[PDB]
Amino acid sequence: MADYLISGGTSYVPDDGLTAQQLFNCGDGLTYNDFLILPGYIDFTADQVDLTSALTKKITLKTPLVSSPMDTVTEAGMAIAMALTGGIGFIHHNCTPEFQANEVRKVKKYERDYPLASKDAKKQLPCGAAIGTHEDDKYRLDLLAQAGVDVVVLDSSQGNSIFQINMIKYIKDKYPNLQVIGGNVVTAAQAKNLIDAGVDALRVGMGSGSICITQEVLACGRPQATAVYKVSEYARRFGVPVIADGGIQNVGHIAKALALGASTVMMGSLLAATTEAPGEYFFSDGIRLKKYRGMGSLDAMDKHDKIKVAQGVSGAVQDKGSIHKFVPYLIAGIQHSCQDIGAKSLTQVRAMMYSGELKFEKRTSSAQVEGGVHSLHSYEKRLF
Amino acid sequence: MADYLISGGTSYVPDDGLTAQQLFNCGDGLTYNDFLILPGYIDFTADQVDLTSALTKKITLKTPLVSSPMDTVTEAGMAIAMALTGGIGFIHHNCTPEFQANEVRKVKKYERDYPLASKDAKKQLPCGAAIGTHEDDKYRLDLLAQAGVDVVVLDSSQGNSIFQINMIKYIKDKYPNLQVIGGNVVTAAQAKNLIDAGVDALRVGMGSGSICITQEVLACGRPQATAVYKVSEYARRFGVPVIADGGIQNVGHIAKALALGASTVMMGSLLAATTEAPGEYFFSDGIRLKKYRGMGSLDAMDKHDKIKVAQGVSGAVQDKGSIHKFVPYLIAGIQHSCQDIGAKSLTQVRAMMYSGELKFEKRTSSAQVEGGVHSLHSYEKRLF
Amino acid sequence: MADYLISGGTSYVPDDGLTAQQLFNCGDGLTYNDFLILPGYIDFTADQVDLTSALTKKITLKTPLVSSPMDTVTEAGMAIAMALTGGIGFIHHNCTPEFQANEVRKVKKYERDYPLASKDAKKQLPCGAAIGTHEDDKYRLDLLAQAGVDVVVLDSSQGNSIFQINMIKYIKDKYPNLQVIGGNVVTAAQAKNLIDAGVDALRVGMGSGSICITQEVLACGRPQATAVYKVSEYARRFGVPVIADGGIQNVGHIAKALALGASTVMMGSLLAATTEAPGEYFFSDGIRLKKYRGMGSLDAMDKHDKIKVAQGVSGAVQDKGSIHKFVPYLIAGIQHSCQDIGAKSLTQVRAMMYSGELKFEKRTSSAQVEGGVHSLHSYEKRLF
Amino acid sequence: MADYLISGGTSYVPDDGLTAQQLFNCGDGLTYNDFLILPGYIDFTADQVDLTSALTKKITLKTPLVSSPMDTVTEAGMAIAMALTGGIGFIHHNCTPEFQANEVRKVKKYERDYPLASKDAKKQLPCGAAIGTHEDDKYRLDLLAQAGVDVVVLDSSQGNSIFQINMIKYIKDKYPNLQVIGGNVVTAAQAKNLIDAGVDALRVGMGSGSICITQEVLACGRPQATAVYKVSEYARRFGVPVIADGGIQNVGHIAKALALGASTVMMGSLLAATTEAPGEYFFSDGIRLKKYRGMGSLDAMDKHDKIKVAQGVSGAVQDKGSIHKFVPYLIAGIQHSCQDIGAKSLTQVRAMMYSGELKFEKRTSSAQVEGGVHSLHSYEKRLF
Ligand SMILES: NC(=O)c1ccc[n+]([C@@H]2O[C@H](COP(=O)([O-])OP(=O)(O)OC[C@H]3O[C@@H](n4cnc5c(N)ncnc54)[C@H](O)[C@@H]3O)[C@@H](O)[C@H]2O)c1
Ligand SMILES: NC(=O)c1ccc[n+]([C@@H]2O[C@H](COP(=O)([O-])OP(=O)(O)OC[C@H]3O[C@@H](n4cnc5c(N)ncnc54)[C@H](O)[C@@H]3O)[C@@H](O)[C@H]2O)c1
Ligand SMILES: NC(=O)c1ccc[n+]([C@@H]2O[C@H](COP(=O)([O-])OP(=O)(O)OC[C@H]3O[C@@H](n4cnc5c(N)ncnc54)[C@H](O)[C@@H]3O)[C@@H](O)[C@H]2O)c1
Ligand SMILES: NC(=O)c1ccc[n+]([C@@H]2O[C@H](COP(=O)([O-])OP(=O)(O)OC[C@H]3O[C@@H](n4cnc5c(N)ncnc54)[C@H](O)[C@@H]3O)[C@@H](O)[C@H]2O)c1
Ligand SMILES: *c1nc2c(ncn2[C@@H]2O[C@H](COP(=O)(O)O)[C@@H](O)[C@H]2O)c(=O)[nH]1
Ligand SMILES: *c1nc2c(ncn2[C@@H]2O[C@H](COP(=O)(O)O)[C@@H](O)[C@H]2O)c(=O)[nH]1
Ligand SMILES: *c1nc2c(ncn2[C@@H]2O[C@H](COP(=O)(O)O)[C@@H](O)[C@H]2O)c(=O)[nH]1
Ligand SMILES: *c1nc2c(ncn2[C@@H]2O[C@H](COP(=O)(O)O)[C@@H](O)[C@H]2O)c(=O)[nH]1
């Protein structure tokens, strides 16, 4: 009976790799490409992995994927597609309040099989919308609330402000049933103020986005993986989920963001130039392209005698096809990643991470080269 | 559903204190008085604590207490008392083989209520006996095996020898059903050789005993708490329990030895001058005393023209009363200690320790003074 | 204008010594004698130091001193004396509920000048009382509430239990206006559970008391200075004050406990054998003495067939005179200590400590010897 | 009253990121791109940020921007433009003394709206001029003093020399009212000698300039961010401001230099190929360009048989437009950066930095890639 009595089953496991706490205690400003998750023990098949995810304190999704509130990413079409694949879309506010409300209404009234489709308590697709922290945003909010919006995100580069805190309080007084997402934040100190003010989730990231130049221009921000880990670890103490926002370039980045403590992942460029994204396709040197621009680029700010300091750029992204084809690929990828690290659900991934059972490893520059494609004359990379 | 979905229950727990791995990675030669166990969460009562303990790979006891094979500690009387209170005694070999075998026979034929009493498969009290690693010990072993001994301990200060390894192999060939305890060892390197040779448990400790001067004379040994932790951590990988032997002065020391990975605790001085211990009581300045001596003292070695290098001393210990009164006090103490640290069983204490959930703290010299009785003119310390 | 413009006043200050965060990040189990506070800048006189202190979330005292709920320390006489000198006393519960309630009534109805005297909203002296976590303590609590008690302390060695959490909830439901002190705790993990359950203050300390042997017997506890710093730092986040309890031997210890984050300091032995303490004076070899005993000593437990594991001892303490003479000395000492470290109030001491402005230094053993009296043939130590 | 009494307001702030002292204690030779400033708490608008800056002990500017004394950067036109936008220009000395004095006189006699325009006590634009440390520089200094120059910079790659110290003493004897800037220095040891000799400011930087090859040729220099932090921290003790000189490529670099302790920032390439810069525009492959060269390049040294060891290169820089359009953009950028990090003035930025309230983070190579523009097919970067 010694085989059981020494340690209560709870067998010996050789200690290899670093816990997340150790990896991010080193003070290096790590981001996603700087580390790997070590593989675990596999006892099940990839199709059994559950991706149920908390968007806010009270809104639950079938998948962890959400589309960013950007005028080249999310309108009613994108919101409908993401809700049907089991996520959610946030409708941008670079438009008039009535226009934005009409987009919300199209999503709320919408209606080749969608077992994961997100619904509210009335069998309607959920829809989010963005607002600012200026005075006219109160009227915009009233119209959105009337359209039946399910959650609003307070859209700012630096959410730890008197303006955002006042707006949060105004909302939680006038609309007690509305869920509010605050941000963007990258530190626990910012997160504390926003959680004290009553947000139901946090949007995490500053300057990591593909179109962002805030770190270069204003010298302020944080490496994204560290930002996600630190804010998630703080917000977990109060039961507040975090949306990891910016710098997602592939399925591995999604999996890493979730393993570091995020509950949902927001995507910009990775959903741009899909069919459901707004704007028209164009051609340049034989490649199909669609515009994709920062909300702080001059063109986006000139969308309605003083210096305007641009914080984003305006570019183009290559065609990706349909959301209905692309999102299943991401889902299958995340499921395979969970299987490799030995977890039956995203909830269990994060539980293993906080308990120290999940292990990580740094990657030097040579290790990143080794990790990519190398030593070939030519190749084709087809993902699915 | 976020309250569950973020981390799967598995709530936030502030990080305070050191894991055992961290405490013993510091390289300080710590022993028992140098550290404390931090308190945990209490959900049950002390009388519900289960003290079931593995003595060997195949022998299980109701309590973790065993009496040392010393000619001032354990003969048939002590062995019977410890078996009745739920532990075991090891009969010493500073005597003729027929004498030792007769002691074993008295224990095996023995027979105010003993629900914890240790039994074998034939409703008989279990009994251990010590042997050396010289040639005549083979004949001594034959007699002990005929008397029906349940386990033998190979009695040496430094068990990692060709002599002990040969004796272990001889025993495991001639008596395949006999359990063998090897030792004493204080390092993983020694433990590896003995476990490879096929021992069913390890006796841990060198120079920590109350009567021992081996560290002073031969400069060889180890601080006991470190020795127990290191050897237990190695032996756990192969399912081999360890007996922590030497330097136990009180119930806190017992609890610490068990929390560091030991399965059973051996006691010398703490059981000397009990009524069941051999030898007669005497008086010296109005105090009742009984002799207690090291097996490597000159008097013990003169018990059967060359230098004899003594490794122990010969002294006297104050009267303690009956084993039947004293052992219940130790049991109640260990149960209260487990309750304070939040464990329902010794198995769960060790599981918590290896998983990092159990936390520890060092104690400076001022901290040890603060921990003891201080700032009083006089006092009486009555333990139970 | 550079003299101002470079750093906004905020002059250069050479970096010397360790912040508290650094001192307690080292992992050594430090207690009070292991460190010193470095002196600061003096701009005022000692008599201007304000000692206003928070006892609970809603009870404020003129001084930080409280008397322990022990049957050799605090009854109505001690409670009246401590309330008159600007602190508070907690009446012990090693007595019948009616007896305890009568003590509370004597304090509440009491009535050579006391500008610091503690009062409640009705110009009555405040009074605390201790209760246990067993079922009959509910009836004891009802009687105490009727007597008009202002605060109750839940009296346990290990407060992080289902029993204490249930009792706290029962109290906060039946008596919403009663302040409740939970404990004893020594870790942030324990503090989290108790703060979540709704305590208004925390009692900190396990095994540090002069009469305590818990660390020796049960191996569980913590060095007191570390315990105070860690729990205070956690409890500060939720606005919960801590009472530092046990191991206070002099004014320097009081000052250190307050600088480490405690709001009030509890005293046992240091108030025993005062005139107001219960029990009679006796003589032993020409010294005047009074009994002082742990609440977990056998005699205290035999105050009304099973092992009782003692956790305290029973001793005697030398006569100290009157509380009305002794407490002013402690007050003057604390004020001088604050002046030396450059703080106008205890609140400002703790603010400096948390901001890193207050600096500390470790003391080796030789440093502690040098710090005490040395190099003399004889001496008299008269404190005031 | 506990909410105030525990810590005196002075709320809890989660500890995230590194202080500047910690960031530069690591011994890595960091420069600007290696780190970020973490965002703080915003309570005000960007247009309220005050950029008042100390140029010397006694000269104060409305903005922290100064133009470098280089013959492709600063003559009378540039000096007038920078003084009108609230900064200052230093006229180069690669010319005859009478020529340089005539430039100074044009600035001193000069005359939209310029609310920030720098003035002296006589309502005249301030003007600086560079001199060397050779004997003929004494006569050059006499002419400059007669032209009414307000400050002189002693122009050297390595200012910690007997020549520079003698020249400083000569100046402070013959012209007690003239402000003197010494440099360039990169270490506290050099700064000590120059401050002891009586300089009123320090020019910091060696080899970081865009046109500089000193680090490659002579192996001597320092990474610029470390140089600025170290020298600023030393010079602050004596009330001496530092000008951060070299390697400024964008607004984020300016903000970082100021947050590390610099009072003003000097710019070379970033002001070259402006309209006010001397030299003519030319075309090369359809791009408008203007020459920009190091003062230690062969062409600059051949401006008046022996090896000349070049320390700079000679190149061309793309057209930037007018100083009057470009400088407002930098000003607005610096103000937004201060707002993001939560400071109402540059003085407050540095106060937060020295007090440990301002926090920083390192950036790995992957973090720098993530910080830039990525994951796009094409883009346009328009800054304002
Ligand atoms: N790193 C990022 O995540 C990031 C970075 C840059 C821009 N963006 C995006 O670009 C867009 C612009 O964001 P932004 O940060 O400029 O936010 P914003 O437009 O709300 O802020 C503009 C400026 O006005 C101030 N302001 C805000 N509310 C105010 C009020 N009520 N009264 C007075 N002043 C007020 C802000 O503090 C800020 O200085 C947003 O959509 C944002 O999401 C994101
Ligand atoms: N620290 C401790 O735990 C400790 C220390 C000293 C003594 N003791 C006790 O004192 C007693 C003395 O034991 P010991 O350690 O002296 O061991 P031991 O009496 O078996 O050995 C005595 C010496 O003889 C050698 N030897 C052993 N077997 C041999 C063989 N077959 N052929 C040739 N040489 C052989 C040993 O290696 C050793 O040098 C034991 O009861 C022991 O438990 C214990
Ligand atoms: N280090 C210290 O601070 C310290 C140490 C020892 C004793 N003491 C003092 O001595 C006295 C003894 O306190 P104690 O710690 O023994 O606590 P206690 O007397 O309340 O508990 C005795 C035992 O009964 C259990 N128990 C408590 N409430 C229960 C309930 N409702 N149902 C079932 N079981 C319950 C406890 O968990 C504990 O094991 C107290 O006055 C205490 O303050 C203090
Ligand atoms: N890293 C930089 O900041 C940097 C680097 C290289 C060049 N520069 C610039 O290029 C130009 C060249 O400057 P430099 O550093 O060559 O200094 P410099 O021209 O004054 O010195 C040239 C050499 O002559 C020596 N010298 C100087 N004064 C002397 C005296 N009175 N008597 C005898 N010898 C003397 C110097 O020590 C040096 O070895 C300057 O405008 C400088 O600002 C700057
Ligand atoms: C910086 N960041 C900006 C800007 N507009 C939006 N954003 C942020 O980027 C995210 C998208 O990043 P991708 O990497 O493309 O997925 C958005 O969600 C938002 O947080 C901007 O102008 N400057
Ligand atoms: C050193 N150690 C010795 C000797 N004889 C026995 N022992 C060891 O001491 C243990 C008992 O220690 P206590 O602290 O009294 O409980 C024994 O079990 C054995 O391991 C000796 O001569 N020298
Ligand atoms: C251990 N600790 C005990 C016991 N009774 C009370 N206490 C604790 O000691 C404190 C007093 O300590 P001093 O150092 O004398 O001031 C009490 O307040 C309580 O916390 C006991 O039996 N065992
Ligand atoms: C090295 N450094 C040189 C030389 N001439 C001037 N300088 C330095 O460079 C600064 C300008 O740097 P940018 O990065 O263009 O702004 C000047 O202010 C001066 O310190 C040289 O020949 N070699």
Numbering used by the authors:
A (entry chain E), B (entry chain D), C (entry chain A), D (entry chain H): 1 to 111, 231 to 423, 435 to 514
What does the article say, verbatim?
Inosine 5′ monophosphate dehydrogenase (IMPDH) is a critical regulatory enzyme in purine nucleotide biosynthesis that is inhibited by the downstream product GTP. IMPDH catalyzes the rate-limiting step of de novo guanine nucleotide biosynthesis—the conversion of inosine 5′-monophosphate (IMP) to xanthosine 5′-monophosphate. The IMPDH protomer consists of a catalytic domain and a regulatory Bateman domain, connected by a flexible hinge. IMPDH constitutively assembles tetramers through catalytic domain interactions, and tetramers reversibly dimerize into octamers through interactions of the Bateman domains in response to binding of ATP or GTP in three allosteric sites.
First, we determined the structure of L245P in the catalytically active extended conformation in the absence of GTP. The approach also allows us to generate focused reconstructions of the repeating octameric subunit and the filament assembly interface. Following symmetry expansion and focused classification, we found that the majority of L245P segments were sorted into fully extended classes (73%) compared to only 17% fully extended WT IMPDH2 segments under these conditions. The extended L245P structures refined to global resolutions that were significantly higher than our earlier WT structures—2.0 Å for the filament assembly interface and the catalytic core and 2.6 Å resolution for the octamer-centered reconstruction. Overall, the structures are nearly identical to the WT structure under this condition at the level of individual protomers, octamers, and the filament assembly interface.
